């Protein structure tokens, strides 16, 4: 539901790359070009940052059970 | 539930030996080296260095079970040349080669930063 810290296959850190990827997409860069600009050359990491679903945002819509 | 502890692939239990020397009885000058808590990393280098030795006529390593953590190294040598000291020779030559490679890598990175 949240971006994994490490790529499953090789172990490159991709926990810091989700927000930069979203910013590049908002900058009308093609997701292939966005992934290229983030240095993810191995297609394992491209899969990592490309197939991720940002479901933690949907969970944040619900109220906390205690404040 | 029955998952083994993660450390157990490299930590020796309370009491057993790291390596054991067993004589093979069906062939002379043949021994089975039982190294505990080890894998293909040491097995392949020791086997390859033994294969480089001309006084060795057999050298092989085997991991009996991937869920277990021991290797069996079988060495057969010329009648004068005992396989135990052949194994010692292999480890010594490997240490020397690794140290030489390390020092050369160190001077290589030194030169690369220097130009």
């Amino acid at each position: 539901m949240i971006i994994p810290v490490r790529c499953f296959t090789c172990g490159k850190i991709v926990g810091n790359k989700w927000e930069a990827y979203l910013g590049l997409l908002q900058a009308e860069y093609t997701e292939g070009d966005a992934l290229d600009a983030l240095g993810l050359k191995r297609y394992c990491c491209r899969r990592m940052l490309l197939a991720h679903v940002d479901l933690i945002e949907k969970l944040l819509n619900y109220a906390p059970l205690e404040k | 539930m029955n998952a083994p502890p993660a450390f157990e692939s490299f930590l020796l239990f309370e009491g057993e030996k790291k390596i054991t020397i067993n004589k093979d009885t069906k062939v002379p000058n043949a021994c089975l080296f039982t190294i505990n808590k080890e894998d293909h990393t040491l097995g392949n280098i020791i086997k390859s260095q033994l294969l480089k030795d001309p006084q060795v006529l057999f050298a092989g390593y085997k991991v009996p079970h991937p869920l277990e953590h021991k290797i069996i190294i079988r060495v057969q040598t010329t009648p004068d040349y005992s396989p135990q000291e052949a194994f010692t020779n292999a480890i010594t030559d490997l240490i020397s080669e690794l140290s030489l490679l390390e020092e050369r890598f160190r001077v290589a990175i030194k030169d690369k930063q220097e130009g």
Partner: protein
């Protein structure tokens, strides 16, 4: 108390199942004689029973979630009769068709076909590596 734990001859101790114990290994539906067979126990870490790939054929067993029923014979008489009657080697050949019920399968079969080809030539070190996975080897390296 340790006075209770003092064993004497004639007592019976219910020890846990150690290695080499004989068990009857059954898979439903129990169709033919080879559907339940005697097996020797080897202790292994994880939570699944483990089988050699050859016995998957007499059991008609796959590894896509198949479960299996183990039975531990309790008396030494029952253990001995399972050992003398129902062990896997003792029943390789089935009476229903007088042919072996179990054989070489899948990976081993394709690789042994690829292995026995006339063009397969093995280097010395490869021969050393393969020769030591032979439990019946006499230790004499053959002439190339």
């Amino acid at each position: 108390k340790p006075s209770d734990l003092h064993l004497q001859t004639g007592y019976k101790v219910e020890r846990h199942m150690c290695d080499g114990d004989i068990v009857i290994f059954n898979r439903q539906p129990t169709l033919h004689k080879m559907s339940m067979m005697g097996h020797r126990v080897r202790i292994l870490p994880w939570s699944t029973f483990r089988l050699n790939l050859s016995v998957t054929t007499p059991y008609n067993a796959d590894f896509d979630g198949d479960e299996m029923n183990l039975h531990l014979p309790q008396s030494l008489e029952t253990r001995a009769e399972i050992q003398e009657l129902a062990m896997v080697p003792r029943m390789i050949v089935t009476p229903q068709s007088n042919r072996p019920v179990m054989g070489i399968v899948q990976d081993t079969l394709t690789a042994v076909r690829k292995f026995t080809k006339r063009d397969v030539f093995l280097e010395r070190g490869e021969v050393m590596n393969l020769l030591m996975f032979l439990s019946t080897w006499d230790g004499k390296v053959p002439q190339p």
